[PDB]
């Protein structure tokens, strides 16, 4: 392949990894605080300080199994709650890849993905599951998989908040959330 798509697939891979990181960390029951830096390390993806949780990374790669979102294959992060009795699917975050190719588009995609991650940081804190998770009685659950997006486990009357979309020569990425 051309190196530009080597970089593009790398960007999409690490955007998916950081996406799972942001969601799961937004459901951990405590506040997140990372510092800015003018002399960054070589591991600050999308110019954001998002610390990787190795267990979340291992489940994210094991779910990913070495592939990227595509037309029909999307990455999903399911946040649920199990009472002391015993399974409510609270929200499913959907990371899709769409057919449309932005042919008028190297690092514009990188910056748009950075902005999309910032939007994810914002949106993950204003859905009901956030303040549900900050008071945990209750224990929060996460599960990463490829879809085959299974909506039904939430309930009837759900609503979808669109985190955002980004256009790439290979397709457009769609980050959204279907929540109870």
């Amino acid at each position: 392949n051309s190196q530009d798509r080597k970089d593009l697939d790398k960007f999409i891979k690490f955007f998916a990894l950081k996406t799972v990181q942001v969601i799961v960390q937004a459901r951990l029951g405590e506040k997140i605080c990372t510092r800015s830096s003018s002399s960054p390390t070589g591991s600050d993806w999308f110019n954001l300080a998002i610390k990787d949780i190795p267990e979340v990374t291992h489940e994210a790669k094991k779910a990913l199994a070495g592939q990227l979102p595509a037309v029909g294959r999307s990455m999903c992060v399911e946040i649920s709650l199990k009472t002391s009795e015993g399974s409510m699917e609270l929200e499913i975050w959907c990371l899709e890849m769409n057919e449309k190719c932005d042919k008028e588009i190297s690092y514009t995609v990188y910056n748009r993905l950075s902005l999309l991650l910032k939007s994810l940081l914002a949106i993950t804190r204003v859905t009901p599951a956030y303040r549900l998770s900050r008071k945990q009685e209750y224990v929060i659950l996460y599960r990463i998989y490829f879809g085959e997006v299974q909506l039904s486990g939430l309930g009837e009357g759900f609503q979808t908040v669109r985190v955002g979309t980004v256009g790439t020569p290979v397709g457009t990425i769609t980050l959204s959330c279907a929540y109870r």
């Binding site: 510092r35 830096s37 804190r125 204003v126 956030y130």
Partner: protein, 205 residues
């Protein structure tokens, strides 16, 4: 063709500040990047932006802001001046505006023209409460409303296509605010205004 967006919130008095800080920061979270370090060859490296969560004392709400403690005061002080003006104005309704502009050089002697490309206005409606129960209920409902506000801000951040192009080194202060140590926002200014509440026409109804 500068894009404009209008928000509106109804809060108790002691909720103005945080409410305002939740909107501003959210917008400024999307309209800022890492600090550029230029090299003599023209290339530059981009710094890393930190983010942190702010819990609200007077609202059942939490928002994400950039980890720049000087920006947080550039916001808190102007929000404090607006909060002063609101109390001094009496029983009347105010608003704050956040404009993003770029500088354009003009031939001598004219000052360089500031052209705005985006403007965010949020109208503040202040309600006075009487019981403690009203205060608690207000603390929750203002949180839910602010959730809706942040959601809409984010969706607008997609419906807006234009952004200024990346400047070169000498061009950088025409596009970016470079005065902060931990974040590089787009050139912005925050002003405020105490409105005269007007009427609604009995025509469309």
């Amino acid at each position: 063709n500068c894009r404009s967006e209008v928000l509106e919130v109804s809060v108790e008095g002691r909720q103005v500040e945080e409410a305002m800080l939740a909107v501003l920061h959210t917008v400024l979270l999307h309209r800022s990047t890492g600090k550029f370090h230029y090299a003599a060859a023209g290339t530059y490296s981009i710094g890393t932006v930190g983010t942190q969560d702010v819990d609200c004392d007077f609202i059942d709400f939490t928002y994400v802001r950039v980890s720049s403690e000087e920006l947080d005061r550039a916001l808190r002080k102007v929000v404090g001046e607006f909060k002063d003006a609101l109390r001094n104005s009496g029983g009347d309704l105010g608003q704050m505006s956040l404009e993003f502009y770029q500088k354009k050089k003009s031939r001598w002697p004219f000052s360089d023209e500031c052209i705005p490309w985006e403007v965010w206005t949020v109208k503040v409606h202040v309600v006075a409460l009487a019981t403690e129960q009203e205060r608690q209920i207000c603390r929750e409902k203002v949180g839910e409303k602010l959730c809706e506000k942040i959601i809409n801000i984010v969706e607008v951040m997609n419906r807006h296509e234009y952004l200024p192009k990346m400047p070169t080194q000498s061009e950088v202060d025409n596009v970016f605010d470079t005065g902060l140590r931990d974040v590089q926002p787009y050139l912005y200014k925050i002003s405020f205004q105490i409105t005269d509440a007007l009427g609604t026409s009995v025509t469309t109804t």
